Design a protein around this nucleic acid. Structure first.
Length: 172
DNA sequence: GCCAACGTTGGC
DNA sequence: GCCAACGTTGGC
């Protein structure tokens, strides 16, 4: 079995150090080759999850910190972890003065859009299922989306990934 | 290396 | 705009 991931981005506008960190799935889809590099991860637990990712592994594009937060679509990894250049750019939002270039602290991956979900899967729906499965022993009982609330890159089990995909087929 | 004092994520 | 959950920093 392969690994599956969840990766958060903010679709609504918000300024960090004067610059817009907005990146929706529509913004990915508009990209050249619908491909971008996933810069600006500055959490050690999360960076390590990037380092664990492999060519072709799928990931949910989660929308966070907006009016309707939830999973919007699928993308896959097209380039494994490598140095994030933005940590050395002096005025960049995600600049890190303690990062030296002989061994760079922070990593990023390249991701490519695959598809939208048949429908948006809001956080609130996910949360009902997660609370319910704590009682019923179902597939979202240990989902990282709710067990580790401040983590932008998350592993998912086969169980969890398939369950999210089955919700896609149901009525809202 | 502990742990008060911050600093940040991100739902609500 | 509020603030809980979770992370980092630095005096001791």
């Amino acid at each position: 079995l392969s690994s599956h991931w969840l990766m958060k981005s903010e679709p609504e506008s918000r300024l960090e150090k004067g610059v817009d960190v907005k990146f929706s799935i529509e913004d990915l889809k508009a990209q050249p080759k619908q491909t971008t590099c996933w810069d600006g991860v500055r959490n050690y637990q999360a960076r390590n999850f990037l380092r664990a990712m492999k060519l072709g592994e799928e990931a949910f594009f989660y929308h966070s910190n907006c009016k309707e937060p939830g999973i919007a679509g699928l993308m896959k990894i097209v380039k494994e972890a490598y140095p994030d250049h933005t940590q050395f750019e002096k005025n960049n939002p995600h600049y890190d003065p303690s990062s030296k270039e002989d061994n760079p602290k922070w990593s990023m991956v390249d991701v490519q859009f695959v598809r939208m979900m048949k429908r948006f899967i809001p956080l609130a729906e996910l949360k009902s299922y997660h609370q319910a499965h704590k009682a019923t022993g179902g597939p979202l009982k240990n989902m990282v989306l709710f067990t580790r609330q401040r983590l932008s890159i998350q592993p998912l089990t086969q169980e969890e990934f398939d369950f999210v995909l089955s919700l896609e087929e149901k009525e809202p």
